[model samples]
Target: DGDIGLIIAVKRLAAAKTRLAPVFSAQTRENVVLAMLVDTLTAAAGVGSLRSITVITPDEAAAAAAAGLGADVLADPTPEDDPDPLNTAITAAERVVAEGASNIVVLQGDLPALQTQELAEAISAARHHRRSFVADRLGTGTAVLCAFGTALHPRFGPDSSARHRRSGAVELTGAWPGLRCDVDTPADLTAARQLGVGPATARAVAH
Candidate 1:
């Protein structure tokens, strides 16, 4: 039981998931990221409890990819140079609110391990807290942040969980390991590999 609205933040394929390139070839990294993003979108849309799920993406490839997954896309036309993807996500979330999404969930597309029930639980918990942030396993970065018809006070970077908490967002906790694991290093990659990287990602890695 959840609302039909969420802003799944996605970036261009070529430039996404670059941080993990050292562990995987450039194409492999992109494949994994795209695959994860695809799976996340699928899970995000599986909330049959909601009426709508919109994906916010500036990257054309990403927009098409999400669209292919059966989610609507909100394209960001202007080129943005923000180094922080969280800020970029916030900016996109504002527009979704403007377009009339009462409740919004800011989800990272990189969580290939995302599960529908885990997301539902996260949303259920977030509803009680007005505003909330879900910390990644690393315990600093935000993997999912929730706000309802409100503008996010963007502060996504190292120690972001603390910053979001300081911004008056509640920290939601529970069995959400897949939702929290983000790939930033070889260690994270190993973790994802163990989780059985999605089809595209697995194919790329195998190739």
Candidate 2:
């Protein structure tokens, strides 16, 4: 198997994770977002075949954090008016990150409880297909979209699981709880908490 490259998109801190605002202050929400990114990157780094991890974001703090974690940073190129900002960001990053990789994976940045082994298993399964996706816990959203030696035509938004399936991507049905838990709302965070978040997220939530 060849090297795997990962792309993660993080929005500016002030504008990220607004759904958690009702339960946390703005600064706390930002802290949680950054912590989750750190945790996600940490888990990704632990994967043996992941040769490169690229983070696409407009936030300076997030870029610095990802850089500190040894991940390449690409300035997010999606304009405010872009109808599909997340997909746009991933598409922009694909050109750069896809260079030496045999496989490309787009992972959601908000999975605080993500485990290295779980992600590794998903990647291993994805390698068999031209394209594959792992649906989130809700089974509607996509948590991981992988393309092997092909362009990642990622459709990652509402009902993204169905969209990815309709686009001819195989759905990887692995028992990866932590990998499926993407924290968006307070309820989502609660689920991740129950699943046990990474150290960075645990520290952030403790404060």
Candidate 3:
């Protein structure tokens, strides 16, 4: 059985998702950031064929939260704290990949609407290729990047979808709303809200 190991990279709650500034108060943004991670982890935990879920973050609070949800935690300096957090994320997850995950999925932490079914399907689709990825709603970013076995080289951040494609990674085709929506700005958040978020996100943004 080719069990998938899902990895999520989370930023410090206090410093995460700054693009939502002013629209969401500082506290609100932090709450929402953690909430989204929780929701995403929850979905990952429920997916069938998932052998492990790992969270990479520098924030103790985030590490605690992910661990509490049954995810293995990997410590790393926050993106703002380090010049290159994306590389740091891959380095942090390498040991886990080495431990024997048939495939690896690198997910974004801000996917409040992510669902287990979509994740499972995407992983299944990626299984057909050595490397594959799901683009964000805007089609410029990547929400989910997958690599089979030793092919787990991650290149995250802006214009990530194009980079992944150019690196010979296959682009998965589907209309998965939850998997496509990653909340970065207020507009992105609005789309995720429309698609419906998980309980943690709902509770964090409660009016």
Candidate 4:
């Protein structure tokens, strides 16, 4: 009867998953990135406790895919404003929080290996805190982060984990694989595949 909010903020596809393109053709890369959007959205949808998942993106393909899965989609106000993901992500977080959501989950664009159960558990744990953050598998930038209804001061960039720690968010040391995987560089993509990718993403890379 009430709002049990938890939104996942994703950047636009054209500005996402940059490093992995070295292994794929231009078109192939776009296809794979879009496929990852479907996969991550599906994975995020599986978390039963989530009231409504809002995905932030200016990409038509991203908004369409998220909408197909019943996610509330919001467009990034400025597509070219920030090459630094942290800046773009904060914009999304601000929007979700402004909508009266008490909790917000910021997600990177790639996470084919995301597992539903793990994500659900992580959300359960995050709800108990003032602020929580989950770093990418590389142990650097953040992959998933949760904040209360107030402004979520996010710091995502080079060595973002440390930056976030200094911003007053506690790091989660749980065993959630999906929450720890985000594709940025080639190595990050390779790590996610080792955990088993979703069908859509697997198909995009099957050629």
Candidate 5:
């Protein structure tokens, strides 16, 4: 637990993926969300560069599952408690970074196709910069954000890649699709499926 710590922030399953509601029912979306988090955590745990993995979510099941996966779980606030979920979650996780951790990585929990090798390579690349981020498929969102110092001031949400860049964080460039692709809508899910989702996600979508 000396290198970068990865934070996987998730929202409540039942309230997640409203954008995908046009194509999938609420139950299906919930299954997909959980599966994605499971796969993402699996990849995070496998990354040798990562010293610790913490999960922030309000959902009891997700918290329990992430804890079961050996990740430290932080209780996420409700929307009413903290309207900005992404920023709030990352801000909270920085506490661990303050206590001797040298670096931090903010990872989205909806990346069903993430691979350990890709994640390792990406984090290695990011370690070269004071702050860096991996852009999502559309180039508008952020899949991963890394802060190599004590000031883990992460601005994640809505056009996060651009915001990070504007804040002077270098944008990482590479052929790491598993690190770039994140599932938010039906189209994203389709793209992730094409790239080959992890077993948990495959099982969730099989039915």
Candidate 6:
């Protein structure tokens, strides 16, 4: 089995998924964020090659949810002076999760429709390169970033796929639609629903 360590970063519930505010209330948006994290972690835990799963978050609810799913929770350490909290959180987590891990994967926390097989196949494809990434459905954003024996310089955000490519990471062109669907807007959520979301997201969307 491959000794891959997975790292997922999540923001505080109240501050997450603000783009969906028009479609959902503040409370409902928070529930959707938590549910997506749960669903993402659930799928990640199912991957047999993953040796460890670490969630970096400052939100108590996210930490609890990750812990409940058997994932190690690391308090986000984004310094007050840091401009990119998401990348900083992943960099800090990389140092910790790097121990005993041959490969490290940084995955977006909003992939509610992620399938175990899709994720596994992505990991398998990633093993061919020192650094690789799977672009999101839009081809601009990044869904997954992999690093082997190198620093995981995660540049996740707007146009992150291009940034990762410029940084020398190979783009993995796999047919894993579920692994590429990251829910951000209502349309993205609908796409994930069409891809068949996990139980947590299914329950959250029901309300």
Q: Give the runs in model 3 whose Cα sits over 4 Å from its true position.
A: 77-82
What TM-score would every model get versus the actual structure? 0.87, 0.97, 0.93, 0.88, 0.94, 0.97
| The candidate that achieves the highest lDDT relative to the unseen native structure | 2
lDDT of 2 by residue, 85-173 (tens): 98999999998887778689999999999999999999999988999999999899999999999999999999999999999999999
lDDT over C-alpha atoms for residue 111 of model 3 = 85
lDDT over C-alpha atoms for residue 191 of model 3: 91
Per-residue lDDT of model 4, residues 55-96, tens digit only: 766678878887887877777675564566555656665665
What is the C-alpha lDDT profile of model 5 across 15-126, one tens digit per residue? 8989988877878888888989999999878888877888888899899889998999989753666667778777877775457577888898988899999889898898
Candidate 1 lDDT, tens digit per residue, 43-137? 76776555566777777777778888777788764356656765766576567554766677778777776778888888888878678889998
Question: Where does candidate 3 have its weakest 10-residue lDDT segment?
Answer: 76-85
| Higher-TM-score candidate of 1 and 2 | 2
Instruction: Give the poorly placed runs of model 4, Cα more than 4 Å off.
Output: 1-4, 79-89
Q: For residues 1-207, what per-residue lDDT tens digits would candidate 3 score against the true structure?
A: 438888887766887889988688888888888989999889878888888888888889899999998888988744565777775776578665558776788888888899889888888888889989999999998988888865666778878889889988999997888989999888988899999999999999883
Error of 3 at 132 (Å): 0.5
Give lDDT per model, in order: 0.74, 0.93, 0.84, 0.74, 0.84, 0.92
RMSD of 2: 1.2
Between candidates 1 and 5, name the one with more favorable TM-score. Answer: 5
